[PDB]
Amino acid sequence: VLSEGEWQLVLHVWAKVEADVAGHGQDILIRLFKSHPETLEKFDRFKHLKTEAEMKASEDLKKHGVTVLTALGAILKKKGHHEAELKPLAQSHATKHKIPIKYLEFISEAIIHVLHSRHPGDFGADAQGAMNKALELFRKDIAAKYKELGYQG
Numbered sequence: 001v002l003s004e005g006e007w008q009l010v011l012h013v014w015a016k017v018e019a020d021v022a023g024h025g026q027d028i029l030i031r032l033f034k035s036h037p038e039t040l041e042k043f044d045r046f047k048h049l050k051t052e053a054e055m056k057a058s059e060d061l062k063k064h065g066v067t068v069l070t071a072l073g074a075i076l077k078k079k080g081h082h083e084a085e086l087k088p089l090a091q092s093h094a095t096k097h098k099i100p101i102k103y104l105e106f107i108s109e110a111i112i113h114v115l116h117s118r119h120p121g122d123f124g125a126d127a128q129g130a131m132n133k134a135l136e137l138f139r140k141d142i143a144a145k146y147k148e149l150g151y152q153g
């Protein structure tokens with residue numbers, strides 16, 4: 001459970017992400033794909049991309065990054081009361097996209113890295129720790145839904 005202070009650090013940097021959601025999404029998905037190539041393989045939509053240049057030029061990738069960040073921002077703003085937002089997501093990612101929880105840890109690391117590169121002043125260690133907790137809560141709650149559905153892993 002994050003404290004109110006922690007949630008404030010989380011949403012303060014997230015308000016900054018909102019100024020350029022598309023740019024953040026692209027950086028995050030590209031980082032995810034480059035750091036963990038197995039993740040790109042889950043996207044039939046994007047697996048044709050072979051280089052970072054191709055990824056940066058993909059408008060559809062940029063479009064999905066916004067989809068991803070929009071869903072995540074709505075979750076973060078619920079400050080833990082994200083049961084309704086997490087249900088459809090867990091269901092689709094477990095059963096449809098078949099995304100292991102480990103891959104959610106990978107994108108959490110990409111998110112934190114990109115937030116740090118773009119918002120050093122509002123993403124000091126205290127904010128990093130708070131965001132890590134927030135992303136951990138997200139993962140914890142998603143994992144519980146996965147386990148229920150028979151996908152814990």
Ligand code: HEM
Nearest residue numbers: 039042043045067068071072088089092097099103104107
């Ligand atoms: C911060 C975590 C993530 C969020 C908030 C998120 C959000 C979304 C949303 C909103 C959709 C569209 C609706 C849906 O299908 O549920 C989606 C689709 C999808 N996501 Fe995620 N996602 C996340 C992480 C991941 C990860 C880590 C992978 C792969 C390693 C993944 C793979 C997919 C795939 C394959 C689709 C369908 C893409 C398509 O073909 O249209 N997602 N995601």
